[PDB]
Structure 1
């Protein structure tokens, strides 16, 4: 049995190294990572890898790792794949814990835009979770938390995190993680996987995939949303991604909206994440 060294960036930024037989399917590595993390609610999570075009791909647990990573390194990230619309219903605190680590990265990276006040509030909950109750001994007027809270840090933001931290006295890590998630779940880009595309006129858009449906971001005005119940079916062919939308009652025929993706692999990738979200959130 020939075994391959696997490296996995965990959500705390640490690197986990393990081995799998070279012929292993993605599920084998995923199960090893989840056992290491003491994670039982595995369905929300997955491993990503970077293809030869440097695009993020989900490692398919059903297929050989080698037939996915192909010419690239056996280097992976552990990530939230399906963001729960209601994290309060997750059965385990440890699940909510990893969801918080993913969301913190979503915020710092800028993938999850956030108001000044909401950056401070989320930050205050993270601090309550990681440090416990406010202590003025590790917070002079000039205090600068080691915690990354935002894509751009200001002293005003650092001061607001501290002021809000003061109000959370007695709050346990589990409680602060729950408060974190009840706020984060309401942000407009929460759980939205964005894909660059052009519409049929060739205009640059973004297609969002999430629990509630598809979003077409033309700009900020007339965002255009298709709830899963409105979507009749989905397909790719070559560079193209097609969405069939139900007719209104007594409208006779479904409509087709077509998009141009950068390449065929981008079209398939989008198709696949749409199918996966549709199955997951039709059921959940």
Structure 2
């Protein structure tokens, strides 16, 4: 029974290696990674792989691994797939821990924009969680943390992390992680999966896919928001992505909004993430 070596980048940046039968479905590998991580609330998470074109794709747990990675290496990342709107409602601290690690990468990467003060506050909770109570013995007037807090680090940001860290004395790791999440969850790009697209006139837009629904970022003076309930139907054909929007009360007919994606694979990928978000956040 022939087995393929899988390499998974975990949210702490370490590498997990395991083997699965070469005809294995994605769920088989995912179950192994989640067991390794002692993760029970698995529904929020998934594995990604970098495709031929080099884009992030979700590994479909229901399909053969080989029919997804195709010509590529069996290399994956472990990631948050569905960002919970209220992390306080997750049943386990370890779930909230993996969500914090994902969000720290969201922030450092610049996928999750954040004010100076929120960067310093989130950083202060990470330090409290990981080192515990503020100790002046480590932190002199020239201190720079090993922790990556932001896309661009400044001495003034390092100083503000320390100032707030001092205020958190006696906070446990679970308590600091929950405070991290109460702040992170309010950020306007929290849990927003962004896709480049063109509108029906060819104007460059971004489509964001989140728990609540669909966002169309046009010019920042107008952002169109479609709550999942207002979305009747989702579809792709060629390089196009279509959404059907319900008639307001007393209107005879749904409206159609069409978008042009870079290529057919980018259209299918947006369609599948919308279907999965719609299903997940209809049930949650």
**Normalising TM by the smaller chain, what interval?**
over 0.9
Paired with 1:28 and 1:18, the residues of 2 have a C-alpha distance of 11
Paired with 1:188 and 1:245, the residues of 2 have a C-alpha distance of 23
Paired with 2:224 and 2:48, the residues of 1 have a C-alpha distance of 29
Aligned twin of 1:70: 70
Identify which range, 249-258 or 68-77, moves more after superposition. 249-258
- SS of aligned partner of 2:47: strand
1:92 equivalent to 2:118? Answer no
The structural deviation recorded for 1:219 is 2.2
Paired with 1:83 and 1:90, the residues of 2 have a C-alpha distance of 11
Paired with 2:81 and 2:129, the residues of 1 have a C-alpha distance of 24
Gaps of 5+ in 2: none
- SS of aligned partner of 1:201: coil
The structural deviation recorded for 1:232 is 1.0
Paired with 1:71 and 1:249, the residues of 2 have a C-alpha distance of 50
Aligned twin of 2:245: 245
The structural deviation recorded for 1:252 is 1.2
Aligned twin of 1:102: 102
The structural deviation recorded for 1:145 is 0.2
Q: How many residues align?
A: 284
Q: Deviations over 1:198-240 (max 9, x none)?
A: 0000000000000000000112111110001111111000000
Aligned twin of 1:154: 154
- SS of aligned partner of 1:224: strand
Aligned twin of 2:223: 223
Paired with 1:131 and 1:43, the residues of 2 have a C-alpha distance of 30
Gaps of 5+ in 1: none
- SS of aligned partner of 1:32: helix
Q: Deviations over 1:133-186 (max 9, x none)?
A: 000000000000000000000000000000000000000000000000000000
Paired with 1:221 and 1:180, the residues of 2 have a C-alpha distance of 30
Paired with 1:75 and 1:24, the residues of 2 have a C-alpha distance of 15
Paired with 2:219 and 2:133, the residues of 1 have a C-alpha distance of 42
Q: Deviations over 1:37-77 (max 9, x none)?
A: 00000000000001000010000000000000000000000
Paired with 2:221 and 2:156, the residues of 1 have a C-alpha distance of 30
- SS of aligned partner of 2:223: coil
1:80 equivalent to 2:94? Answer no
Aligned twin of 1:113: 113
TM-score for both structures, normalised by structure 1: 1.00
Paired with 1:59 and 1:5, the residues of 2 have a C-alpha distance of 16
Aligned twin of 2:211: 211
Aligned twin of 1:60: 60
Paired with 1:49 and 1:196, the residues of 2 have a C-alpha distance of 19
- SS of aligned partner of 2:137: helix
Please list every run of at least 4 consecutive aligned residues from structure 1 whose deviation after the TM superposition is greater than 3 angstroms: none
